[PDB]
Amino acid sequence: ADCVVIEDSFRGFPTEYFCTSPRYDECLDYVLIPNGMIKDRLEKMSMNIVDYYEACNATSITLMCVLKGGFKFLADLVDGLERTVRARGIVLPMSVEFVRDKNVLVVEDIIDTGKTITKLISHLDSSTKSVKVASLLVKRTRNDYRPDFVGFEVPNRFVVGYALDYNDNFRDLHHICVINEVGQKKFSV
Amino acid sequence: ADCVVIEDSFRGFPTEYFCTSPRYDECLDYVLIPNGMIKDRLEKMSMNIVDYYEACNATSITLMCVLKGGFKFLADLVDGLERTVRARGIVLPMSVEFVRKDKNVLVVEDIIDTGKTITKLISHLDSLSTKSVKVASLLVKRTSPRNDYRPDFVGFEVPNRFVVGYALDYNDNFRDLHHICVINEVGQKKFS
Amino acid sequence: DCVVIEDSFRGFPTEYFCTSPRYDECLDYVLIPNGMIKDRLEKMSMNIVDYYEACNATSITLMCVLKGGFKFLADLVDGLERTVRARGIVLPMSVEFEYKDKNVLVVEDIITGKTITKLISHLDSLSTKSVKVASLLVKRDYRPDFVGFEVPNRFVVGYALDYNDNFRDLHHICVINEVGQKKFSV
Amino acid sequence: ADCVVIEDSFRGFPTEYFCTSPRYDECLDYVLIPNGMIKDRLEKMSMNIVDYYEACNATSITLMCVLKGGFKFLADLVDGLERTVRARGIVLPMSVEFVRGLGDPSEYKDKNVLVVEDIIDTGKTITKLISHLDSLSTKSVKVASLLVKRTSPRNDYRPDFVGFEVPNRFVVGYALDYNDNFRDLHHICVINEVGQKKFSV
Ligand SMILES: O=c1[nH]cnc2c1ncn2[C@@H]1O[C@H](COP(=O)(O)O)[C@@H](O)[C@H]1O
Ligand SMILES: O=c1[nH]cnc2c1ncn2[C@@H]1O[C@H](COP(=O)(O)O)[C@@H](O)[C@H]1O
Ligand SMILES: O=c1[nH]cnc2c1ncn2[C@@H]1O[C@H](COP(=O)(O)O)[C@@H](O)[C@H]1O
Ligand SMILES: O=c1[nH]cnc2c1ncn2[C@@H]1O[C@H](COP(=O)(O)O)[C@@H](O)[C@H]1O
């Protein structure tokens, strides 16, 4: 459950020094997690997931992508998993299933209060071999729940980008950023 | 449209000189298209798509992922489109819908052999009063006689041989392969 | 102007990123992950191409200063090639590791500035047509024409940056501790 | 069974379906090896090199790049090497040096040198180097060549690690040059006639 903990002292990275979608010129305060940061973290995370599912003699695993917030995370994550199982010479069959007794790894976007991931975990437990949750981001409240694999622990702010949406928008953004009030007013109701 | 033609005389590249997942040891005949070649073609496909919708004045574009096969394809293609939209400074909003009104729908599918699936899907799209309906296909099977229909954007035109990898499946197996490969008969029998 | 890494930033723990097992105990933290470098180099390359399009430069010659900037030159040349290629412009590029009267973009690793002064001074012998300098990192006052990150006055390794021809194979840009700083003393 | 063989029947891919430097628009016949295919090959090459130098417990391993021609191949090769060593917990200390010869210590002795060159054709350019390296009392001298030209008759020398075996046509791109041009090209291509006349000696 230990991860890259973004402290509330971190002010982020201003958008002017990166490549963001020109569509969101005035709508972003700063970049929180660059895209390459996400990739680099997902490498080590892929190693952790693989060696965990080898410590337990798992015959196979099935990733469950929760659309549409976890697609980029699932894509890069599957790249890292196939890469790791490729280099290490293991024979670990992985399946991918998208939803809006087998080993199930939930591929989620972010945990805020946990009311959504717990209904899923209780939905698959309604007779499954195993149920695990992997979340790219985690929100620091503290919440009583934590996923099994966590990439980043972020402050109590609303983030967008990397297929994370603020009212069905900002998904085509390359990095993980925090909206300001201008974009909030522009894309909310 | 015109694309990279994988000639029938192409013998492929043997899997031993690339990285294959260990679970398909004696199941792959050869490697037809390496992953990196797919990506390098997807760069040009992204440019073609973006400046097509820029020749038009599309207010947005809605990509339709045809699951489960087109998921890697849609991933790297969305990376290409995003990378050329922000590289040319053009404002062009892109949304992503998934399957298994009055918008510019770009269908993203894995391969087209006969065209039954793409015909049914396109017919379903024609009822919702879409602004435009274009189709982007990664692979196109060269059949005899040549198939009556061809997509608006095509990555590779490959021979009439069953291919797997890059999320191309064979009874929900072979998806976790990095490259597009032709199966042998031992692998076709191994999964039934 | 670039990305400023303030001094109150402790970095990220090495145990959360993939690092070479060679330097298990010799790394305090990571300042800048590798992918963040890759994402900043996009904007930096765009800035360089835009400066060489404000005027009509008919050529550009990148000067790699081995051994520190070979990774930075690799990904920088990749970004420049990808930008020139993406914008359909005809910007011919050469790499220089006797070829004079050319626009020079010096690709150095990090800058006191006493080394870059030796570079620019040595350039006056051939009299280049134009000289500009781009550096990946700057430690805390002089500034090159293109800067990527601004780091504290601490010591950084990785990404071909070396402490006595060492730590170059490290993927990310890290900060070492005193035990590692003494385990590779010259 | 040394490497990927690009048979003489292979006609390549037309340059219009890939992203090419627009200045060489009319100078390229076709694309021989796309960039991503090169990197895909360099994954497996990195694995082979790593487990070779680990099977014999090589203390140090020093990659020597033949400069200008072999730079990009060195960069992607080092990428793959550090990646595959990172994913295995292996400790394999690698160094990097460069040559054009322009590199001398003379402490190269007792070390394991891995030569990183761009392409082998006749074999004399590399033979002079291996002769100049086996004179410094090195523990081992091996060569990694990205491309190898198919010669008639077959060349009496084949490097230890080969990426691709290409037909006997002239190739450019991916730091491969023709009269110090075509280096900024992204893929490995073959020059046509207009490109052969546009950069003559
Ligand atoms: O900061 C955010 N940005 C975008 N979506 C969020 C954010 N925080 C929570 N969500 C979404 O809120 C939903 C429920 O999260 P919960 O509050 O943990 O139950 C999920 O779909 C999350 O992706
Ligand atoms: O060779 C193949 N390998 C894997 N899937 C194929 C192949 N050929 C056709 N398909 C599948 O066939 C479906 C539609 O093809 P069609 O109906 O023949 O046009 C798609 O969902 C493809 O995944
Ligand atoms: O923190 C560091 N780690 C490794 N090398 C450094 C570091 N800081 C400066 N250098 C090297 O110091 C030399 C000159 O730097 P300058 O004195 O700031 O101009 C160059 O070779 C740099 O690579
Ligand atoms: O087809 C080619 N394209 C570009 N450079 C080549 C080609 N063939 C050989 N070279 C270069 O010319 C020299 C030929 O070496 P040799 O023929 O093995 O003795 C080496 O420096 C090669 O890098």
Number of Cβ atoms within 10 Å of the Cβ of D200:
7
For ligand 4, atom 21, name the residue with the nearest CA: D125
| Atom of ligand 4 at shortest range from CA of D169 | 1
Q: Which ligand is nearest to the CA of D129?
A: 4
Report CA(D91)–ligand 3 centroid distance (Å).
26
CB burial of residue D88 (10 Å; 0-12, 13-18, 19+): middle
Tally of CA atoms within 13 A in the half-sphere of B107 that contains its CB: 27
Q: CA separation (Å) from D85 to C13, D15, D163?
A: 20, 35, 19
In the chain, the amino acid numbered B175 is R
Tokens 């400046």 belong to residue: B51
Q: Chain C: nearest CA to D156, how far in angstroms?
A: 33
Question: What is the spatial distance between Cα C71 and Cα C74, in angstroms, rounded to a whole number?
Answer: 5
Specify the resolution in Å.
2.8
Q: How far is the CA of D84 from the centre of ligand 4 (A)?
A: 29
CA distance linking residue C79 with residue C73, whole number of Å: 10
Q: Are strands A28-33 and A176-179 parallel, antiparallel or unpaired?
A: antiparallel
Q: How far apart, in whole angstroms, are the C-alpha atoms of residue A141 and residue C106? A: 48
Domain locations along chain B:
1-192
Q: Transcribe chain D into DSSP letters.
A: --SEE--TT---B-GGGS---GGGTTTEEEEEE-HHHHHHHHHHHHHHHHHHHHHTT-S-EEEEEETTTTHHHHHHHHHHHHHHHHTTT----EEEEEE------S--TTSEEEEEEEEESSSHHHHHHHHHHTTS--SEEEEEEEEEE--SSPPS---SEEEEEE-SS-EEBTTB-SSS-STT-SSEEEE-HHHHHHT--
Residue type, B76: D
Q: Is B18 in the pocket of ligand 2 (CB under 6 A)?
A: no
Tokens of C103: 């626009």
Nearest CA in chain B to D44: B18
**What was the elucidation method?**
X-ray
CB contact under 8 A, D44 and B17: yes
Measured CA to CA, the distance from residue B141 to residue B161 in angstroms comes to 8
* Alpha-carbon span A87 to C133, nearest angstrom: 40
Three-state SS letters, chain C: CCEECCCCCCCECHHHCCCCHHHCCCEEEEEECHHHHHHHHHHHHHHHHHHHHHCCCCCEEEEECCCCCHHHHHHHHHHHHHHHHHCCCCCCEEEECCCCCCEEEEEEEECCCHHHHHHHHHHCCCCCCEEEEEEEEEECCCCCCEEEEEECCCCEEECCECCCCCCCCCCCEEEECHHHHHHCCC
Which residues are within 8 A (CB) of B185 and not within 5 positions of it... i.e. 6 or more apart?
A: none
Cβ contact (<8 Å) for B93 and A23? yes
The Cα diameter of chain B in Å comes to 51
The dihedral region occupied by D123, where left means phi > 0, alpha psi between -120 and 50, and beta the remainder, is: left
Residue of A nearest to C171 (CA): A40
Provide the 10 A C-beta neighbour count for residue D124: 9
The full 3-state SS of B118-154, as one line of letters, equals HHHHHHHHCCCCCCEEEEEEEEEECCCCCCCCCCCEE
CB burial string B74-92: b at 16+ within 10 A, e below: bbbbbbbbbbbbbbbeeeb
Q: Do A41 and C34 touch (CB under 8 A)?
A: no
* CATH, domain D1-201, list 3.40.50.720, 2.60.120.1060, 3.40.50.2020, 1.20.1440.230: 3.40.50.2020
Rounded Cα gap, residues B14 and A68, in angstroms: 37
Helices (H), B56-115: 71-87
Give the bridge partners for B99, in sequence order: B66
Q: Which residues of D touch A83 (CB under 8 A)?
A: 87
Strand duo C3-4 + A149-154: pairing: unpaired
Which tokens in the block code for residue C83? 């930008």
Q: Cβ(D115)–Cβ(D64) under 8 Å?
A: yes
- Cα-Cα end-to-end distance for chain C: 35
Among C148, B88, C73, C43, smallest CA distance to A175 is for C43
For residue B28, the SS3 value is: strand
Report angle CA D27, D30, D36 to the nearest 5 degrees: 115
User: Looking at domain A1-189, which of 3.40.50.2300, 3.40.50.1010, 3.40.50.2020, 3.30.1490.20 is its CATH number?
Assistant: 3.40.50.2020
Q: By three-state DSSP, how is residue B60 classified? A: coil
Which atom of ligand 2 is nearest the CA belonging to B161?
1
Inter-CA distances, B138 with B38, B69, B167, C23, C60, Å: 9, 10, 11, 43, 37
Phi, psi of A124 (to 5 degrees): -80, -25
Instruction: Report the chain C residue with the minimal C-alpha distance to residue A5.
Output: C12
The reply to whether C98 touches chain D by the CB within 8 Å rule is: no
Is A26 an interface residue toward B (CB < 8 Å)?
A: no
Residues with CB under 6 A from ligand 4: D 69, 118-126, 170-172, 176-177
CA of B79 to the centre of ligand 2 (A): 24
How is D119-130 classified by DSSP, letter by letter? Answer: EESSSHHHHHHH
- Measure the CA–CA gap between D52 and D142, rounded to whole angstroms: 11
Q: What is d(CA D167, CA C29) in angstroms, rounded to the nearest whole number? A: 49
- Put simply, whether C45 touches B (Cβ < 8 Å) is no
C-alpha dihedral, A16 to A20 to A26 to A29, nearest 10°: -70
What Å distances lie between residue A18 and A33, A39, A142, B91, CA to CA? 11, 16, 32, 16
Q: Is any Cβ of chain A less than 8 angstroms from the Cβ of D46? A: no
Which ligand 1 atom is at minimum distance from the Cα of A143? Answer: 18
Residues contacting ligand 3 via CB (< 6 Å): C 68, 109-115, 155-157, 161-163
| Cα C186 from chain centre | 24
Residue ranges lining ligand 1, Cβ < 6 Å: A 69, 109-116, 139, 158-159, 164-165
Best mutation target among C15, C18, C22 (most D Cβ atoms within 10 Å) is C22
What are the residue numbers of the active site of D?
121
Order across the sheet with A61-66: list the strands.
Answer: A4-5, A149-154, A130-139, A103-111, A61-66, A94-99
| Number of residues written out for chain D | 201
The residues after which chain B has a C–N gap greater than 2.5 Å are 100
Q: Is B159 exposed, middle or buried (0-12, 13-18, 19+ CB in 10 A)?
A: middle
Search chain A and give the residue with CA nearest C2: A17
Classify B3 as helix, strand or coil. coil
DSSP state of B168: B
Do the beta carbons of residue D113 and residue D140 sit within 8 Å?
A: yes
- In three-state secondary structure terms, B17 is helix
From residue C142, give the alpha-carbon distance in Å to each of B99, C7, C110, C112, C154: 56, 18, 12, 8, 17
Question: Chain C interface, mutation test: which of D96, D118, D185, most C Cβ atoms within 10 Å?
Answer: D96
3-state secondary structure of B169: coil
Q: Report which protein residue has its CA nearest ligand 1's atom 2.
A: A158
Order of strands across the sheet that contains C27-32 = C27-32, C173-176, C156-157
Per 3-state DSSP, what percentage of chain B is helix, strand, and coil (rounded to 5)? 30, 30, 40
Cβ proximity of D164 and D152 under 8 Å: no
Looking from the CA of A161 toward its CB, the CA atoms found within 13 Å total: 26
Active-site choice (B25, B110, B113, B169): B113
Tokens coding A126: 């309604």
Spatial distance between the Cα atoms of D10 and C186, rounded to a whole number of angstroms: 54
- Look-up of token digits 């021989």: D32
Q: How many CB atoms lie within 10 A of CB D153?
A: 5
Q: Going edge to edge, which strands form the sheet with C3-4?
A: C3-4, C146-151, C130-139, C103-110, C60-64, C93-96
For residues C8 and A9, is the Cβ–Cβ distance under 8 A? Answer: yes
- Token readout for C95 is 């790499």
Instruction: Respond yes or no: is residue A2 known to be catalytic.
Output: no
Distance CA B14, CA B37 (A): 16
Q: Do C18 and A47 touch (CB under 8 A)?
A: yes
Nearest to D87 by CA among B34, B71, B19: B19
To test the pocket of ligand 4, the residue of D73, D115, D125, D162 to mutate (highest count of ligand atoms within 8 Å of its CB) is D125
DSSP class of A173: -
The closest alpha carbon to C115, from C168, C165, C65, belongs to: C65
- Choosing among D19, D63, D71, D189, which should be mutated to test the C contact, i.e. which has the most C CBs within 10 A? D71
How far apart, in whole angstroms, are the C-alpha atoms of residue A78 and residue A49?
11
> Would you tell me how many other CB atoms lie within 10 Å of the CB of residue A10?
16
List the strands of the sheet with D171-172, edge to edge: D28-33, D188-191, D171-172
Residues C148 and C71: their CA atoms lie apart, in Å, by 14
Are C18 and A43 in contact (CB < 8 Å)? yes
The answer to whether A69 and A165 have CB atoms below 8 angstroms apart is yes
Q: Which residues contact B54 (CB under 8 A, 6 or more apart)?
A: B90, B92
- B13 contacts on D by Cβ (under 8 Å): 4
Breaks in chain C (C to N > 2.5 A) come right after 97, 111, 140
- C1-186 CATH, one of 3.40.50.2020, 3.40.50.1980, 3.10.20.30, 3.30.470.10: 3.40.50.2020
CA distance D49 to D57: 12
Element (H, E) at B44: helix B35-55
Distance B130 CA to ligand 2 centre (A): 25
Please give the backbone phi and psi of residue D95, each rounded to the nearest 5 degrees, phi first: -115, 170
Q: Which residues contact D17 (CB under 8 A, 6 or more apart)?
A: B2, B3, B4, B41, B44
Catalytic residue among A2, A76, A109, A112: A112
Q: How far is the CA of C68 from the centre of ligand 3 (A)?
A: 9
CB proximity C43 to B under 8 Å: no
Q: Measured between alpha carbons, how far is B92 from B50 in angstroms, rounded to an integer?
A: 9
- Contact by Cβ (8 Å): D76, D116: no
- Cβ-Cβ contacts under 8 Å for D191 (sequence gap 6 or more): D27, D28, D29, D170, D172, D178, D182
- The residues, ordered by sequence, that sit 6+ positions from D90 with a Cβ below 8 Å of its Cβ are C21, D50, D54
Residues C46 and C34: their CA atoms lie apart, in Å, by 19
The answer to whether the beta carbons of residues C38 and C149 sit under 8 Å apart is no
Cβ-contact A85, D88 below 8 angstroms: no
Q: What is the C-alpha separation between C22 and D92, in angstroms, rounded?
A: 8
Q: C108 is written with which tokens?
A: 């150095």
- Measured in degrees and rounded to the nearest 5, phi and psi for residue B160 equal -80, 70
* Residue D35 · residue B36 · CB < 8 Å: yes
What single letter denotes the amino acid at residue A36? Answer: G
Whether residues B22 and A91 touch (CB distance < 8 A) is answered with: yes
- Interfacial A residues in 139-168 facing B (CB < 8 Å): 163, 168
- Distance CA(D182)–CA(B17), nearest Å, equals 27
Tell me if the domain spanning B1-192 has CATH number 3.40.50.2020. Answer: yes
Give the tokens for residue B67. 């699951």
Which amino acid is residue D47, in one-letter code?
M
What would the 3-class secondary structure string for A89-146 be? CCCCCEEEEEECCCEEEEEEEEECCCHHHHHHHHHHCCCCCEEEEEEEEEECCCCCCC
Helix H or strand E encompassing A64: strand A61-66
